[PDB]
Symmetry: D2
Amino acid sequence: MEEARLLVTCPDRPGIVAAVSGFLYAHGANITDLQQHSTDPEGGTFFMRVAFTASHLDLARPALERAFQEVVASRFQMQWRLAYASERKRTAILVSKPAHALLELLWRYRVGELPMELRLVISNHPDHREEVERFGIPYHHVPVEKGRKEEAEERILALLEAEGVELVVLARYMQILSPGFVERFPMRIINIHHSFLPAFAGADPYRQAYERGVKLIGATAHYVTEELDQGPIIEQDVVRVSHRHSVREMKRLGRELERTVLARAVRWHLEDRILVHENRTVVFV
Amino acid sequence: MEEARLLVTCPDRPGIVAAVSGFLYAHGANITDLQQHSTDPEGGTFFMRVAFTASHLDLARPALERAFQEVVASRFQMQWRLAYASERKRTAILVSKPAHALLELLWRYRVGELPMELRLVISNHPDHREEVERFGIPYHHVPVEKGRKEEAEERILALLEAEGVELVVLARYMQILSPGFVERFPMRIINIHHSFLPAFAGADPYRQAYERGVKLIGATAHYVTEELDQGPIIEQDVVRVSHRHSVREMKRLGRELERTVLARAVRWHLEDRILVHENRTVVFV
Amino acid sequence: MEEARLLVTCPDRPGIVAAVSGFLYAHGANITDLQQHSTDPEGGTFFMRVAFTASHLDLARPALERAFQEVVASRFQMQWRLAYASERKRTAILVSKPAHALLELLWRYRVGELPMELRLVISNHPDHREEVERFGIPYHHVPVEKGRKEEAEERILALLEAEGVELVVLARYMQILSPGFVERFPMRIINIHHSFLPAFAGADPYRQAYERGVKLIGATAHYVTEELDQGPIIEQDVVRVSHRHSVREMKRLGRELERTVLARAVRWHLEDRILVHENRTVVFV
Amino acid sequence: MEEARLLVTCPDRPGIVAAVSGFLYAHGANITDLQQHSTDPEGGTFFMRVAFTASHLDLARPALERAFQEVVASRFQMQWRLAYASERKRTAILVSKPAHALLELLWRYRVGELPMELRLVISNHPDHREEVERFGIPYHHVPVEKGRKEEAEERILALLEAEGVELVVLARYMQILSPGFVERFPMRIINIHHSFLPAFAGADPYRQAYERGVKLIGATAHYVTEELDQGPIIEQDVVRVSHRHSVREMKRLGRELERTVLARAVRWHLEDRILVHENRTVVFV
């Protein structure tokens, strides 16, 4: 069967669920999943993901959209999107030196545990061409020269635009992205990075965490923003470490943690379970 | 504010959520929480817990019930219940020799983390009278004599009936309950017990688990049934153990695990998040 | 640098650690990891794993082994072993229809997370030939015909001998192994399989479970033994399930659980961290 | 039976385990637990905890201590300690407005899960007098007036001295302690407090967090030091949060996290499982 997903965010008022479930009912659909959240009882914002089925979710789609928009969307000033499971989001993976993130994604993709359409892997290094190509996926090596940054980014954009990339995944890509680039992929660029307690801003954090004697290693997957501030956090987790682990053993623990947290975030983004509002997310698991 | 909770279970058909959220909307309520589950897309059974607020949830209650029953309940052959947070379920704790379960409950109750009204603690032993009374709660020691079982149970029932006990919690009560007794507390008697992998039916399981070299200890909180088969499982969890732990150390791990799992189940039952159907539960966390 | 590992098991006696470490000291070795365990304070059996490095673990090895046998071993009646990290254990993987456990092993092996030397994969089905050989590993299909089981085992055994397999992993191999077969691999056959709370013995476990309303799913890896009883358990773990997950998604989590649990017991074995005594194990992680 | 614990720390050298265990053996002791650690393979510092029992740990103790000092200690330049389980450490608890951390300590102490000898509770508020004294523990209220902080510390110190406090626990004590105060309790003051990913420095942490859309909350227990920097971390842990939880329920989970995390570091300390070297700790659990 075909599963349609209705993602909705709007100002919190009474009757949104009644309106939506009621609209869907009149169009002969059957809710298979319904979740909602309100940042505040009265006032604030409303969030809802509704997964459902219905006969002929084909040419019956543009019409389903027109009606929802006229009948419900406009009434509640809703921000929404109707997504179908059969749809496979054209994605791209940018990567630099580290390969733990990329590999987990490629493999999880290969055994069919990530519902996407991986179009290509872009890297400012050649290191992974062999492994990536063995998966039947285009590997594009486009160097990132000093000052010649704009040089590189132009190619990358053309590349993604040519392929119709809807999602860009930074699998430990070590180069910064100008606000202009990020501007073309709003809440469409997922990134991963190391976290700690307390936070460790410096050179070789995995040496500073060990130096402070931390008992935890964190990792944070988030949406990338032009904004001066880190984008909407998607997922966060930690791996326990003890006096036992050496800078060598912590790094391995942190990678396993990173590739896991990142895949989790990508899987969620692909299953359409992430709703963004302001600089936070509402993840409907 | 006052929080009202609508628990509903019925045969799965399209339009239940539309009907319920729509009814609540017309009665000027605001959904603060909505969760639902369907055992099967088409066919099967429907479950839903709706927490909400509204002005004057007082004398506006019996009327809210009449309408829901005439307008929604009868239409969908629903099994339902309207519960209020201000309501404090009159409960009772039966206990025998072990005290880990009872203590966790008493304390969690004392620091206000269990929304109930503990009326009394019944025991077929005297062991805990001192601790229980220090909490300002009646301790009733009613022996359970050989063959004179019916003798004991009569007192216990009279006791609970006199107090208006709505929930009975077996905090490691070591005596069996005749089907007649259980018959007066349908899905109102929560119990806790040890679990393993593989299961260990015998004398001194905590010696057989250690003897088999298990790496896990389990505990299961469930509703008690006259039925020959263990009642609806509410919650289940495990605690990891290694070659290191001795029968002495496993027992301590299993108790900490039991009192935790049991309190969790009681807290859920009290917050009205447990829906029973057949011999399973749908817990809305 | 070469990491030597000393695994020792013997009747618990005072002074075993003194004798073992004193010996290693005299031989100019430095202990990098030391772990011990005693089943009982008085009497019982002692277990210990000592990882150390030393100048010239070259042909200095045989002498190291002779000296330990004479000076410490015979004296304490210990069953021991001295392994070298660089000795990648020649292993084989048996598999039937299900591929989740096989794939995990293959990928973790390729990414270097499993220190072994995969020599071959054997199956009573041809299904996985393409994928396994894509990893550069020989695929040998040996059907298992009712009545002709005898003939199958002999071939399987010929292949393992010709390859000098030291470890046999059953990644969800669905065919029974005769005691005659197992007798040839004392504590050298690791198997994986389902587990539930309560347990289940029938057709469709992930069915009788969804049926009982369990909140957990268990997986158990263990060495295989000739006798009736299941062999020493190596690792056990769980995955939380609920009302949300379906009978389908319950099987998916069960696979991801098994694959992780089995790969873990394999790595611990390959890393020489498992000691067996009776029908239980000591795992020094 | 009396369990003796030998905590040792010294410049990593070959033969330390040989010398320590050989010594204990000669003195007729039996090792029940042995754990060691080396920060670096070559050079660095060695850490070790040995739990053992022995015939007549009576006045045989001073001799045991003399002999170890002469034969092993001075030789390896080790900072060591020999603790006896029966020596219940005299401890004190400081607390301000928040009571969650205090209550947990009090209850776990009463139920016997914290091997210590609570001598007193001191607060710059009178709020908890009734509850603390209900546990049979003296309550001493010492206000902290701006400008009169000096006068407060002196009294607090007089109370601790008169009681012979060996361990000072800060169960969310909201007042600053002068270096002069801390200097009197080298590695003897355990404190607890919030932590986030990313961290937060302002008014209302559980506000700036709900603000950033974090999915975790952290708590860190650690010894207090005179210097600017936070002292050696003892334990760290987390609690997952989401969109579901509110700013209210985020504080509730944060309390339950802190109380558990602090009580854990306290028990490990009381059980002599913490060794400090520089600004980090080694925790042998």
